[PDB]
Structure 1
């Protein structure tokens, strides 16, 4: 039922007149997002099957709903931007966001390793064009080149890995078919078989090493602070790690042991750099490394508790970090430079936005249980069963998560703004709508997030 309404969103933008466009693209996507919450939430004893494998089913995917929720939310943010540009290019651009969401529907629904991978790499091309065009800053080409240099050099090793496994054992295709799984005997030939499957999802899931892929894409932003939400979807786009570790190699996880250790310093040293940096977007970009590092620590332990925390964190980060980029968008559209020291002063000009600043910053910390505490606390309790010493390393991260939020608040709480003559008008009706449509689903998930953290829960 999710094939050919997003494909029917494609001719909608082209056929509609120049006066409309934005009114049609948003309204005919909100009712599509209503149907995802209507049908996909149902589960039996185990994983179902909606149709024959073109798009399969859901096992532990309420993350599909999040992409459908961001299906109109990106169009909300890019309203002040692309208002002075050509009308034909507006029709060209919305279709490129739709095409991203088209393949994103496919990747989460399809329970394959072969069909998933080629449509996982089909999200790379639209983002490349979205980054390298309409980029407000210079040297945006480095953000484009390294986007496909880091990812493809790690992901093309999947072709030599995935096809090798299906040549030996049956076929990967149906996944629920793949329970012919033989335990990996830990040989030197199997060393690179494990590494090639992981390294593809060591780039999009940022570690300490090979992590420069992320901040360059955010500092040299695709569009101001509007199309960054698609890059948040690429962060949670590395959900194949949940499927590869579980199915393809359950016995041999001795090679996972150094990768947890590499991501353990991808918690402290990635949070240390995120304290002095001048760019407001980079202060979200480096914080997004640490919160997504939590999942990489969790998955490789392979305990049932870690999967509960990880699946929660994938949804938690997808609505909290993206909300922080919307706050960075609102500051950049007025000042036109993302310097934190320059843009200083809330409440004197922006009274209502200051409360939305709090409901977005403090969610990086463990508030009264939204989804972030539920995401983090299960992972920390999972790391103790792994090893007792972890909470000493994890506890330092809990201190610097306060140094994320409050430092973003204090540098905006200092009432001055002497040099600023702009930012006269407080906020548009669509501007405050972005603050509500990101936070209120998090506030509704405080009550019962049973249909959020669900890998057999």
Structure 2
């Protein structure tokens, strides 16, 4: 009853937040108790609900078996079958946790319309969570494009100076591309008469028809996760989007493409994936190398982190397309690890510095460790986590993905090791500059990190380290599920 509880609760919650606020429009001036203290009584309801959704998945977690093969909790709601397996459990779990942190990140840095902002965040979180627990290509697409409606309006209403430029980019790049995925989903519905996962996993298609389907789906994936040369939308969006939007966008939305490879490519187009795997490596490795050199010559603060997320999402794609359990498990752990470190960086860069000094030019800031020591501590730690330090969860993902590539292709997959060096250059050059030399002359001394901003960083750091030190909390769940995607015949 997971999905039935999940959708109904939020739909009930949305109506509750709609009723309480919009009842006072009327003809009367807004002298109301609810809007007192920046709608504090309507933000708290929204923050409670995002916490509750985490409790819904936990109720179905304790029943989850880590040893049974296939989809579990199979339920039919809205004439759609919903199931949870090893991979879908951790991505749903990660998605819901980023719910409260997205709301709490913009708790006191909006000019108004907090009720609209809260409902928009929850709808993005639930639709993302529901996307991992569907059981057909059509339903995968519906929850893969429904997020555009709140995401397009969230960026435009609550954006930066260039929000108009970015609002188009997120709407059109993710629609002019995902449509090319609608063609391939439709072809399955014509020649097989169903888009159900289990039905289409067992059907082999001709050598040509797999290529036509692979291209149509890889186009909608190579755009959703920014892969060169169609990566030119995320940096603009990340610069302009609000802190809640940036946290969800690089935290969950870009991981849908990694999960999209698991559902839409590996099982049902298994043969053609082996044919495309050398091509993916050339595209991915050049994405890793270019997106790390491009980051060196950047200036904008939030754009710098935006290109950093691209590099660590190229490592995921390199690992997932490896045909071994080592590559696949590490690619999934890295997505989980990158689901906390990347949102954390946007809190430091675009959620603490920007919320005080209101600028995003790297030339102003330097030597912030002189009067902001606590900010530097989390700046250095989240910088070393983002670079692949062994005690972090990024390293476990980055080691296994690099090792997984070498097993598949020892020659070109060796270039995947460039992420070890390149991630250190552009990242520390930001951390070295932000915490080096005399305190900048352009910045007045202000408040240090507050309790709210400390809380987010501490609860985005701990999961990263826990996975890094002891990733068997994650590997054990995935080991059965990840072993199904592998395609090989040994004689």
TM-score, length of structure 1 as denominator length: 0.92
Q: Which residue of 2 aligns with 1:162?
A: 185
Distance 1:150 1:163, change over 3 A: same
Does 2:427 correspond to 1:399?
no
Q: 2:75 aligns with which of 42, 46, 51?
A: 51
Q: Which residue of 1 aligns with 2:97?
A: 69
Deviations 1:402-428 (A, max 9, x none): 113321211111243343453421122
Inter-partner Cα distance in structure 1 for 2:405 and 2:179: 32
Contact 1:57 1:111 in 2 (8 A): no
Choose from 346, 364, 374 the match for 2:368.
346
Partners of 1:68 and 1:257 in 2: CA distance: 35
Is 1:214 aligned to 2:234, yes or no?
Answer: yes
Partner of 1:307: 328
Candidates 17, 35, 39, aligned match of 1:18: 35
Flag the 1:171–1:302 CA change in 2: closer, same or farther, 3 A.
farther
1:328-407 mapped onto 2 (5 Å cutoff): 328=349, 329-390=351-412, 392-407=414-429
Matched position secondary structure for 2:228: coil
1:456 aligns with 2:479: yes
After superposition, the Cα gap between the structure-2 partners of 1:263 and 1:81, relative to the gap in structure 1 and judged at 3 Å, is same
Residues 19-418 of structure 1: pairs in structure 2 closer than 5 A: 19=36, 20-40=41-61, 42-43=64-65, 44-46=67-69, 47-52=71-76, 53-61=80-88, 62-82=90-110, 84-85=111-112, 89-138=113-162, 140-173=163-196, 175-182=197-204, 184-187=205-208, 189-219=209-239, 221-223=240-242, 225-232=243-250, 233-238=252-257, 239-253=259-273, 254-328=275-349, 329-390=351-412, 392-418=414-440
For residues 440 and 118 of structure 1, what CA distance do their matches in structure 2 show? 34
| Alignment-derived partner of residue 25 in structure 2 | none
Q: Select which of 446, 450, 459 maps to 1:424.
A: 446
Q: Distance in 1 between matches of 2:254 and 2:343?
A: 11
- CA distance, structure 1, for counterparts of residue 145 and residue 166 of structure 2: 17
- Structure 1 residues not aligned, in runs of 5+: none
Please list the CA deviations of residues 261-310 of structure 1 after superposition, one character each: whole Å capped at 9, or x if unmatched.
11111011110011121111111111111110112222333333221111
In structure 2, the residue corresponding to 1:56 is in which secondary structure? strand
**Change beyond 3 A, Cα 1:391–1:179:** closer
How many residues are matched?
447
Matches of 2:316 and 2:469 in 1, distance apart? 23
Q: Contact conserved, 1:114 with 1:172, CA < 8 A, in 2?
A: yes
Q: Paired residue for 2:12, among 8, 21, 44?
A: 8
Q: 1:350 to 1:226 in 2, by over 3 A?
A: farther
Instruction: Give CA-to-partner distance per residue, 1:76-107, whole Å, 9 cap, x none.
Output: 1112311x42xxx2212211111111211210
Aligned equivalents of 2:200, 2:283: Cα separation in 1: 30
Q: Which moved more, 1:11-20 or 1:115-124?
A: 11-20
Q: Quote the Cα distance in structure 2 between the aligned partners of 1:290 and 1:251.
A: 27
Q: CA deviation at 1:59?
A: 3.6
Quick one: structure 1 residues 425 and 149, their matched pair in 2 at CA, closer, same or farther if it must change by over 3 Å? same
CA positional deviation for 1:145: 1.7
CA distance in 1, matches of 2:473, 2:199: 25
Is this contact kept in 2: 1:274–1:283, CA < 8 A?
yes
CA distance in 1, matches of 2:245, 2:156: 12
**Aligned equivalents of 1:315, 1:145: Cα separation in 2:** 29
CA contact 1:135–1:222 (8 Å) conserved in 2: yes
Quick one: structure 1 residues 278 and 374, their matched pair in 2 at CA, closer, same or farther if it must change by over 3 Å?
A: same
The secondary structure found in structure 2 opposite 1:55 is strand
Q: Aligned equivalents of 1:190 and 1:399: distance in 2?
A: 37
Q: Which SS does the other structure have where 2:295 is aligned?
A: coil
Distance in 2 between the 1:11 and 1:76 partners?
21
Structure 2 SS opposite 1:240: helix
Looking at structure 2, the residues matched to 256 and 163 of structure 1 have their Cα atoms a distance apart, in angstroms, of: 24
CA RMSD of aligned residues (A): 2.1
Task: Give distance in 1, aligned partners of 2:100 and 2:368.
Answer: 28
Query: Is the 2:131–2:140 Cα contact (8 Å) retained in structure 1?
Result: yes
Question: Residue 321 of structure 2 contacts residue 328 of structure 2 at CA under 8 Å; is this kept in 1?
Answer: no
